[PDB]
């Protein structure tokens, strides 16, 4: 399959309750592999997957340092967003960063990211070309100016194209047994009468990895997008995910409906009905 590696920063100011909290999580696809949290008793990069444990002592010291430096920078950043947006020092604010790389099956770059958000709205994003920025407003334009001035996009591209893809390839190899295994969903259709004359068919998918899945109800072979109730894909706790789609159908009509399952662990897309 295709793969990705992402790092997600969250920096959260908390006036009156100490210095902003800085949190870093690193994911290969939908597996968390590494974490850093400035509130930990001893703030350090910590392994969250077995296959990253086999990284040497230097790795952890280098990676912790990056994260301790970033803690400061991202705290510098919140103070800056305060000036740039003429806000007061009494409110709690959030800066987030997602950056990383997608690789094709062959293992080379498909796309790279480096974007930030301030209080849950877009601030600045590295464009697909990895040499230009999209600033969201006049505040983030100041950052853009600064970032062009100091050849940042260029450094991202050297990373996104070199280290990102190379470490991602080493990770997928060391964690081959899990990272390159797709677990198919276990599927069944449940039948819950509601009125005398209306029933709930719910299509389940359980125990699948990765998270990406398509679940669709059809009536006489037609999409029922607007009659279908769809829950967000949810983690089980054992690395796997769950999802359901549901339709409310009239009684005696359960056989006009079919559930459609698409997922990367399945050779064929599944068609399933309600069975007695």
């Amino acid at each position: 399959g295709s793969h990705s590696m992402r790092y997600f920063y969250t920096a959260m100011s908390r006036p009156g309750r100490g210095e902003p909290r800085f949190i870093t999580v690193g994911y290969v696809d939908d597996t968390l592999f590494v974490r850093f949290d400035s509130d930990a008793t001893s703030p350090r990069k910590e392994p969250r997957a077995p296959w990253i444990e086999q990284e040497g002592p230097e790795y952890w010291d280098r990676e912790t340092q990056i994260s301790k430096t970033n803690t400061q920078t991202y705290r510098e950043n919140l103070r800056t967003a305060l000036r740039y947006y003429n806000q007061s020092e009494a409110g709690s604010h959030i800066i987030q960063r997602m950056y990383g790389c997608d690789v094709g099956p062959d293992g080379r770059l498909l796309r790279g990211y480096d974007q930030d958000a301030y209080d849950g709205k877009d601030y600045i994003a590295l464009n697909e070309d990895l040499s230009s920025w999209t600033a969201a407003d006049t505040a983030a334009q100041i950052t853009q100016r600064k970032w062009e001035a100091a050849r940042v996009a260029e450094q991202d591209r050297a990373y996104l194209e070199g280290l990102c893809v190379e470490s991602l390839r080493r990770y997928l190899e060391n964690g081959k047994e899990t990272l390159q295994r797709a677990d198919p969903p276990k599927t069944h259709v449940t039948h819950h009468p509601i009125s005398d004359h209306e029933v709930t068919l719910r299509c389940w998918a359980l125990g699948f990895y990765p998270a990406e899945i398509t679940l669709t109800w059809q009536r006489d072979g037609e999409d029922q997008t607007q009659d279908t109730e769809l829950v967000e894909t949810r983690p089980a706790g054992d690395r796997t995910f769950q999802k359901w789609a549901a339709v409310v159908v009239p009684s005696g009509e359960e056989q006009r409906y079919t559930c459609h399952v698409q997922h990367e662990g399945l050779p064929k897309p599944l068609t399933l009905r309600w069975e007695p």
């Binding site: 790092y7 920063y9 690193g26 990676e63 990056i66 994260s67 430096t69 970033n70 920078t73 991202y74 510098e76 950043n77 800056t80 967003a81 740039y84 800066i95 960063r97 950056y99 930030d116 100041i142 950052t143 600064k146 970032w147 100091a150 940042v152 450094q155 991202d156 990373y159 280290l163 990102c164 190379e166 470490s167």
Partner: peptide, 9 residues
């Protein structure tokens, strides 16, 4: 592996 130190806003 992470990129080096991130840059100021």
């Amino acid at each position: 592996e992470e990129a080096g130190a991130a840059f100021s806003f």
